[PDB]
């Protein structure tokens, strides 16, 4: 165990780009010697954690790039920049984890490296340093380019069992000659002394350049670029040279923020002989050692057979065992060390978010079929008075229940308060409770939709009784029909979610998105920026927004993006009820 060769990193592309071939293919170069695989390549460990099928879930999609450190983002070269790219291409920078990028499928029809490198800078903004250069196109793809060592690789085959340097042919001499030019000078921009030799025509050593290139991608600056074709085992080893050349490792990223019971809010080193802070991202029932929590380390040693506190849930449980998943294998272990991750076997209240110390340790917390229907709840207005009353033959035995109750109006969000104002025994004690569960019972659904009613308070003032013919259900009706009509002649309204939304589109639908949305009666806030894009939000209500993204899409070229979260309730407009009621 060495922190510094420790590489933890996840996949991410639009859906077809090649994650699940580039990610097979890595685990079997890697192997001819899973929320979380491991597998090695030079020395170096590296944890593949597994990242969200459609980038649209954002709750997962922050936690995987929260847990992983850098990234390896795919193309379909004969496609360049797609719209989920840009999707996981913002939440990266949201999250400053370095990149690299893999122009995969360099076999297929179509494919160019320069339409990748172009989309590149001119969708995403992104400053891509070319770091190898292919040799034939499609059909002919064969070999690679090793721009910053000046190396040509040759594959005779599409198995992955034949690999050769070969000299750099001369059709791509020259080619090869000016990026390797150009490669120098982004890392002039990172390193003083690389830039008095690119002066002064002298030729740096690879460790300055790798260093410097290193340098300029953790910072967030460059986006080195690696091109192969994963199908057709080409490139595969070269993008696991780069994952350890450039992507970072546990120390080269800035400390996670973790808030203390006081809100002191204190930054957690990877110490791996300090306090013992971690979280747990994903949890998954294994078959065979019965449901699997992973979880990230972040400070400090976790032991197998040990106690944890569980910060989140205040519980306490017991570490059983510490697996480690391989490609083909299960490995058990003593420990996970600060800036590693692995499955820990045991735990029984954790679930997916939660944060796990030591037992005595700073107690930080590091987190915080039908047709889709809204949430309606109906209200009344003004005060009302009305009054209850079942009274019949029903079952040989007469009925009779009679109660007058006084409805009216509460702020917004109050919730429910109930009165006996009855005195004098006017209603027979025994059976008050019949009257206030009629009452709970007629709120469940309102006489406008059929939805919960709510904010309002109700008063028992008054009512009779029959010497024999009363009863616990008669006065259980009385108190349901007051309640339905109270809601009826209290001109009554209905009530609806209002939600805070987040568009982000290319400034280049602005004015579009901007428009739509007032469409659906929503109510813009205000901008900002981000990038290239621009982040629109308002206030929208949950009805109007069914089918958004099947629509923010056909806006923008599906390059729209959007999430959103309940905010209040407010009145629907009288147009909007009325046609409800329908
Ligand atoms: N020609 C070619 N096609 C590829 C390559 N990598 C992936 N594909 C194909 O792309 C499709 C999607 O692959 P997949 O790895 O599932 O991508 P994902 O949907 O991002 O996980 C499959 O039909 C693959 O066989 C490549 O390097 N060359």
Redesign the pocket.
Same mark, same amino acid.
């Given at each position: 165990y060495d922190l510094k060769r420790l590489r933890n990193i996840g996949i991410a @592309?639009?859906? &077809?780009? $090649? #994650? /699940? /071939? /580039?990610t097979?293919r890595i685990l079997y170069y890697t192997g001819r010697i899973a929320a979380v695989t491991t597998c090695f390549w030079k020395d170096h460990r590296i944890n593949i954690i597994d990242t969200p099928g459609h980038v649209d879930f954002t709750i997962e999609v922050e936690r995987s790039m929260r847990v992983l450190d850098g990234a390896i983002v795919?193309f379909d070269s004969s496609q360049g920049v797609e719209p989920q790219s840009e999707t996981v291409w913002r939440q990266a920078e949201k999250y400053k984890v370095p990149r690299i990028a893999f122009a995969? #499928?360099? &076999? #297929?029809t179509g494919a160019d490296l320069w339409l990748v490198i172009r989309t590149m800078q001119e969708r995403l903004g992104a400053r891509p340093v070319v770091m190898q250069l292919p040799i034939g196109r499609e059909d002919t793809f064969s070999g690679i380019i090793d721009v910053l060592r000046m190396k040509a690789y040759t594959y005779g085959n599409d198995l992955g069992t034949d690999i050769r340097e070969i000299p750099i042919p001369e059709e791509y001499l020259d080619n090869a000659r000016e990026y390797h030019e150009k490669l120098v000078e982004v890392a002039a921009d990172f390193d003083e002394n690389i830039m008095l030799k690119y002066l002064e025509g002298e030729e740096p050593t690879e460790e300055e350049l790798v260093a410097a290139i290193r340098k300029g991608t953790i910072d967030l600056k460059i986006t080195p670029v690696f091109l $192969?074709? @994963?199908? #057709?085992n080409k490139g595969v080893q070269l993008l696991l040279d780069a994952v350890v050349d450039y992507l970072p490792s546990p120390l080269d990223i800035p400390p996670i923020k973790g808030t203390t019971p006081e809100g002191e809010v204190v930054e957690i080193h990877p110490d791996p002989n300090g306090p013992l802070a971690a979280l747990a991202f994903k949890i998954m029932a294994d078959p065979y050692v019965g449901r699997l929590t992973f979880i990230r380390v972040y400070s400090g040693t976790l032991t197998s057979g040990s106690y944890v506190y569980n910060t989140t849930k205040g519980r306490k449980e017991r570490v059983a065992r510490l697996l480690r998943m391989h490609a083909n294998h299960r490995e058990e272990v003593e420990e996970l060390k600060a800036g590693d991750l692995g499955a820990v076997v045991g735990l029984k209240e954790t679930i997916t978010g939660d944060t796990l110390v030591g037992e005595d340790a700073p107690r930080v917390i590091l987190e915080s079929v039908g047709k889709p229907q809204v949430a309606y709840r109906e209200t009344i207005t003004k005060p009302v008075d009305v009054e209850g009353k079942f009274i019949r033959q029903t079952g040989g035995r007469g009925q009779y229940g009679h109660v007058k109750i006084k409805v009216e109006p509460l702020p917004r969000g109050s919730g429910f308060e109930f009165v006996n104002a009855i005195v004098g025994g006017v209603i027979p004690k025994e059976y008050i409770p019949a009257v206030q569960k009629g009452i709970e019972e007629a709120m469940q659904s309102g006489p406008l939709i059929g939805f919960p009613v709510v904010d309002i308070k109700v008063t028992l003032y008054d009512g009779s009784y029959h010497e024999v013919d009363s009863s616990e259900m008669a006065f259980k009706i009385a108190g349901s029909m007051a309640i339905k009509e109270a809601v009826q002649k209290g001109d009554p309204v209905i009530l609806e979610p209002i939600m805070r939304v987040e568009v982000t589109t290319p400034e280049e639908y602005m004015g579009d998105v901007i428009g739509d949305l007032n469409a659906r009666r929503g109510q813009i806030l205000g901008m900002e920026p981000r990038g290239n894009a621009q982040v629109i939000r308002a206030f929208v209500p949950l009805a109007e927004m069914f089918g958004y993204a099947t629509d923010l899409r056909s806006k923008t070229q599906g390059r729209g993006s959007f999430v959103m979260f309940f905010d209040h309730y407010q009145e629907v407009p009288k147009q909007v009820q009325e046609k409800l009621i329908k």
């Open positions: @592309a639009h859906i &077809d780009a $090649g #994650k /699940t /071939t /580039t097979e795919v995969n #499928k360099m &076999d #297929k $192969g074709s @994963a199908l #057709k």
